[PDB]
Amino acid sequence: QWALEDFEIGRPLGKGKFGNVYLAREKQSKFILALKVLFKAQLEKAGVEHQLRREVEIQSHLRHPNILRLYGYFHDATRVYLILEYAPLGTVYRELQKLSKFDEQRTATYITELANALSYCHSKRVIHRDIKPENLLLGSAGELKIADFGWSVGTLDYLPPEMIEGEKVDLWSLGVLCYEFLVGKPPFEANTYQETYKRISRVEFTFPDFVTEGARDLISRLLKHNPSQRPMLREVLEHPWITANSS
Numbered sequence: 001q002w003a004l005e006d007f008e009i010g011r012p013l014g015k016g017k018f019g020n021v022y023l024a025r026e027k028q029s030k031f032i033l034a035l036k037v038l039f040k041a042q043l044e045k046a047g048v049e050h051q052l053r054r055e056v057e058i059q060s061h062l063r064h065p066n067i068l069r070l071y072g073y074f075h076d077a078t079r080v081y082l083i084l085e086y087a088p089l090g091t092v093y094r095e096l097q098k099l100s101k102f103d104e105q106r107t108a109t110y111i112t113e114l115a116n117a118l119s120y121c122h123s124k125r126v127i128h129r130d131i132k133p134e135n136l137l138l139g140s141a142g143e144l145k146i147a148d149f150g151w152s153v154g155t156l157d158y159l160p161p162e163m164i165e166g167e168k169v170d171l172w173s174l175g176v177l178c179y180e181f182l183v184g185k186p187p188f189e190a191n192t193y194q195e196t197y198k199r200i201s202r203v204e205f206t207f208p209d210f211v212t213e214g215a216r217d218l219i220s221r222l223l224k225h226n227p228s229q230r231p232m233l234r235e236v237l238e239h240p241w242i243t244a245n246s247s
């Protein structure tokens with residue numbers, strides 16, 4: 001039970017294919033938040049209307065410090081609105097660009113924060129797909145926040161081989177993200193989609209010389225072609241390299 005008139009709209013926080021996300025404030029409470037404006041006619045054309053409803057229904061039942069909270073949703077004649085948590089410190093992707101690459105502490109901490117979020121979901125029967133650093137936002141204390149529509153009950157980089165050839169997708173992603181964090185680009189980056197495909201399929205990639213043993217060990221184990229070879233989330237959180245380096 002919300003209306004556009006309940007909100008003061010600030011500047012845009014991001015510009016998507018299906019409309020912008022705006023910094024917004026709730027007038028009565030002065031609650032600061034983000035508002036995603038999706039256009040109905042634009043949603044129908046793409047036929048994503050059902051996936052969106054299903055996605056919103058799943059998200060709304062999710063409460064974890066490392067998942068961007070969806071407070072609710074509403075619509076008018078032409079638009080659909082999603083009411084989101086505001087993450088003041090921008091995306092991890094933007095942070096990577098500025099720093100080139102993260103150190104082991106930041107990486108390990110981020111992997112911990114991620115594994116925790118996934119663990120919470122895995123205990124509620126919720127599964128995630130690939131996770132891109134563009135969809136990872138930062139809280140006021142620099143805590144990481146999964147912000148995407150990839151929950152269930154593009155670029156190939158973050159997708160595992162069992163999904164591009166046609167569960168354990170989550171764990172593949174942590175491998176990709178951990179590599180990307182320490183290195184500065186994801187392990188299968190190519191100039192064409194079709195090349196990336198081939199790299200993922202073969203698990204063809206190398207480490208730079210600065211990547212340490214413990215990191216090589218975790219990434220290598222997470223990026224196994226065979227899904228049943230990949231470690232459990234519990235194993236990831238208790239990997240020596242994680243425990244030595246995380247917060």
Ligand SMILES: CCc1ccc(/N=C2\S/C(=C\c3ccncc3)C(=O)N2CCOC)cc1
Binds near residue numbers: 013084087149
């Ligand atoms: C339903 C949960 C959800 C909603 C929108 C999402 N996409 C988001 S959120 C966002 C910016 C933001 C900044 C600070 N605080 C909050 C958000 C942003 O830039 N995107 C991608 C553009 O929309 C397709 C991701 C997840």
